[PDB]
Design an enzyme around this catalytic site. Structure first.
Site, short mmCIF file in Angstrom:
data_model
loop_
_atom_site.label_atom_id
_atom_site.label_comp_id
_atom_site.label_asym_id
_atom_site.label_seq_id
_atom_site.Cartn_x
_atom_site.Cartn_y
_atom_site.Cartn_z
N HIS A 165 -79.17 82.11 76.05
CA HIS A 165 -79.63 82.75 77.28
C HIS A 165 -78.99 84.11 77.55
O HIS A 165 -78.03 84.51 76.88
CB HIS A 165 -79.36 81.83 78.48
CG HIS A 165 -77.91 81.69 78.80
ND1 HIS A 165 -77.23 82.56 79.63
CD2 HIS A 165 -76.99 80.79 78.37
CE1 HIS A 165 -75.97 82.19 79.71
NE2 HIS A 165 -75.79 81.12 78.96
N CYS B 153 -72.71 77.30 75.62
CA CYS B 153 -73.94 78.06 75.44
C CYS B 153 -73.77 79.22 74.47
O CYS B 153 -72.65 79.66 74.16
CB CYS B 153 -74.44 78.61 76.77
SG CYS B 153 -75.19 77.40 77.88
C1 LIG Z 1 -73.45 77.01 78.72
O1 LIG Z 1 -72.38 77.30 78.21
C2 LIG Z 1 -73.63 76.82 80.22
C3 LIG Z 1 -74.21 78.14 80.82
N1 LIG Z 1 -73.53 79.24 80.11
C4 LIG Z 1 -72.69 79.77 80.94
C5 LIG Z 1 -71.73 80.81 80.43
O2 LIG Z 1 -70.91 81.29 81.25
O3 LIG Z 1 -71.85 81.10 79.20
C6 LIG Z 1 -72.97 79.61 82.39
S1 LIG Z 1 -71.43 79.09 83.23
C7 LIG Z 1 -71.17 80.54 84.28
C8 LIG Z 1 -74.06 78.55 82.31
C9 LIG Z 1 -73.87 77.47 83.36
C10 LIG Z 1 -74.30 75.45 80.44
C11 LIG Z 1 -75.78 75.41 80.82
O4 LIG Z 1 -74.08 74.69 79.24
#
Ligand SMILES: *C(=O)[C@@H]([C@@H]1N=C(C(=O)O)[C@H](SC)[C@@H]1C)[C@@H](C)O
Ligand code: NA
EC number: 2.3.2.-
Length: 351
Positions: free
Chosen positions: A280, A298
């Site tokens: 993302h 992520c």
């Molecule tokens: C993934 O790691 C999470 C998702 N990624 C985040 C990041 O900071 O990289 C945000 S936390 C601010 C977000 C919640 C999750 C969906 O696994």
């Protein structure tokens, strides 16, 4: 001269007659002059007689918990024969509806398994598998494996070959799926395998490299999971895509108000595990992308690379993560099926 003979697919007085097949009547040494089938309160069942007058069959779905009465007359040179038969169909304790992925007429990536999810636990997994008919073209060996008590998956040993047609007929109506549980209906879907798209995230380089049919078309700096919450190594299957989505940690078991809980809206998110791993947009970490891991797991990339991924990667394409300090993605994650060794998958777990 012979008297006509009547033969039916059911017997008079039978109970538990299954409703996964039509009811038929055949005449010998004569032809069928009259065939009617009626339920308890007199409603006629739709049927059709063959042109040569030798075989009658029901043509609509027969119901659970019905008592049907069949009346048939055969006429031939040698005279007449008439029979009346009454029988009762299966009486289920419960119904379960299957739901199939991917979508009908969809084109998906080479990692997409056939997925059949029932809305109840299945007591007789073997009976379910037996009722599911998979056609592949070109034909390829594959096998069933259960992710949990409700969802079964089918895939080949290796990633699908592009251009493969896959047809899935889930013929569960009238089928006893164990402990009095019967299929609510049949379902069918057909899909096709598209280009081979494999994206590899190498923790040694912090680059997410997208290959289409073997050629590099994109190289995305990324920031994966920090050492305390690393990104698992392994093969991930791409699932759904979102122009934007609110990430809620509680969805994945983690209380928002808790230590690494979170609730954040993010752009251009492509899901690659049920456990919550996404590719993302992460404008806050563009400095770290390509250098250090900073996420919850992520795959943080730039806003434009996240949108590129959204536009160019499809359900069933593959993301491989390697060289991280995480373990391996669970085989039964939901999008982790390819991490199960083929010998184990092929052996199945229907018992
Ligand atoms: C993934 O790691 C999470 C998702 N990624 C985040 C990041 O900071 O990289 C945000 S936390 C601010 C977000 C919640 C999750 C969906 O696994
Ligand atoms: Na693909």
């Amino acid at each position: 001269l012979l008297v006509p003979k009547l033969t039916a697919s059911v017997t008079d007085g039978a109970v538990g007659v299954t409703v996964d097949a039509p009811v038929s009547v055949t005449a010998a040494d004569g032809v069928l002059a009259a065939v009617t089938m009626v339920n308890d309160n007199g409603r006629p069942v739709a049927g059709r007689l063959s042109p040569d007058g030798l075989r009658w069959s029901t043509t609509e779905q027969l119901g659970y918990n019905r008592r049907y009465t069949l009346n048939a007359t055969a006429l031939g040179l040698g005279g007449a024969a008439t029979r009346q038969l009454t029988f009762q169909t299966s009486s289920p304790a419960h119904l379960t509806m299957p739901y199939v992925m991917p979508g009908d007429g969809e084109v998906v990536g080479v990692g997409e398994p056939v997925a059949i999810r029932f809305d109840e636990n299945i007591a007789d997994r073997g009976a379910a598998e037996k009722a599911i008919k998979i056609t592949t073209n070109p034909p390829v060996e594959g096998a069933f494996y259960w992710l949990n008590n409700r969802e079964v998956r089918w895939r080949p040993e290796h990633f699908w070959k592009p251009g493969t047609a896959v047809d899935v007929a889930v013929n569960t109506y009238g089928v006893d799926l164990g402990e009095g549980m019967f299929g609510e209906d049949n379902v069918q879907t057909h899909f096709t395998i598209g280009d081979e798209v494999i994206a590899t995230a190498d923790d040694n380089t912090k680059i997410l490299t997208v290959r289409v049919n073997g050629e590099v078309v994109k190289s995305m700096p990324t920031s994966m999971g920090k050492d305390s919450t690393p990104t698992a190594n392994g093969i991930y299957i791409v699932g759904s895509r979102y122009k934007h989505i609110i990430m809620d940690s509680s969805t994945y078991g983690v209380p928002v108000n808790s230590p690494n809980g979170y609730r954040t809206d993010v752009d251009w998110a492509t899901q690659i595990s049920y456990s919550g791993v996404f590719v993302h947009s992460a404008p806050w970490s563009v400095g770290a992308q390509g250098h250090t891991n900073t996420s919850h797991g992520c795959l943080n990339v730039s806003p434009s690379n996240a949108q590129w991924f959204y536009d160019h990667v499809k359900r069933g394409d593959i993301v491989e993560v390697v060289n991280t300090v995480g373990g391996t993605l669970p085989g039964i994650d939901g999008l982790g099926d390819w991490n199960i060794p083929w010998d184990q998958w092929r052996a199945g777990n229907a018992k």
